Design a protein around this ligand. Structure first.
Ligand SMILES: O=C(O)CCc1nc2c(=O)[nH]c(=O)[nH]c2n(C[C@H](O)[C@H](O)[C@H](O)CO)c1=O
Ligand SMILES: O=C(O)CCc1nc2c(=O)[nH]c(=O)[nH]c2n(C[C@H](O)[C@H](O)[C@H](O)CO)c1=O
Ligand SMILES: [Hg+2]
Length: 202
């Protein structure tokens, strides 16, 4: 479980494996390894992954084919920066929201323009149906970043990235064409089943 408040930006140091069988990945991130333990859950670009080994400077993870299929981790190369956030089990969320780290799909950046001190991003999800769980002013996690929806229609959604965030996440420097991990606010899927189980009586 996470908050979507990215703690640091690590750097991929080694990637081995294949798209069909899985990746073994090594990440440099001393900033968040002071309290590491094998088995811990760490979100890499919003993808919850299990620590398989670590030291004061690096930690490794095993990435399953399905994780690589639904996220941008399949494109990872040594040298790439990634958003990182350590797990936390808390029933409270005063900052960010309830991010599970279970990515729904990827979205392509289709527009990026400056609006004052903020950056206006527009994304096109590979799986349009996730848009049914996205609403104006609602939450969403992009590459593990908790953000506020500023616009949404039948094929895209947008967010505004403020100055404070631009220096904390990899999104700031991504461009049109790049992919980001999308995790819609889980509550939406919950209310969907609620109405379904509801009219399941009507
Ligand atoms: O909660 C736990 O105890 C398990 C942690 C965990 N680990 C991995 C992993 O190590 N490798 C993985 O490849 N996946 C893990 N996952 C699932 C992963 O996040 C998911 O496939 C993507 O987000 C796309 O939806 C995990 O949930
Ligand atoms: O809790 C709320 O109602 C606000 C949600 C929220 N929105 C944004 C945003 O829209 N743009 C943003 O640029 N940031 C938002 N943030 C903060 C952002 O996640 C954080 O700076 C990074 O992850 C690094 O820790 C938000 O928390
Ligand atoms: Hg998880």
């Amino acid at each position: 479980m996470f908050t979507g408040l990215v703690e640091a930006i690590g750097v991929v140091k080694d990637v081995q494996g294949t798209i069909d069988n899985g990746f073994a990945m090594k990440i440099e991130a001393p900033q968040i390894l002071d309290d590491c333990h094998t088995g811990d859950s760490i979100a890499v670009n919003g993808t919850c992954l299990t620590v398989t080994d670590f030291d004061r400077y690096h930690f490794t993870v095993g990435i399953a084919p399905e994780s690589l299929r639904l996220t941008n981790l399949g494109q990872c190369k040594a040298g790439d920066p990634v958003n990182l956030e350590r797990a936390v089990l808390s029933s409270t969320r005063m900052g960010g929201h309830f991010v599970q780290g279970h990515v729904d799909t990827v979205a392509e950046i289709v527009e990026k323009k400056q609006d004052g001190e903020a950056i206006d991003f527009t994304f096109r999800p590979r799986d349009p149906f996730v848009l049914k769980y996205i609403v104006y002013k609602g939450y969403i996690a992009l590459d593990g970043t908790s953000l506020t929806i500023t616009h949404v229609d039948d094929s895209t959604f947008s967010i505004m990235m403020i100055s404070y965030t631009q220096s904390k996440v990899i999104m700031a420097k991504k461009n049109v064409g790049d992919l980001v991990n999308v995790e819609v606010d889980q509550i939406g899927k919950y209310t969907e089943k609620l109405v379904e189980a509801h009219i399941a009586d009507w």
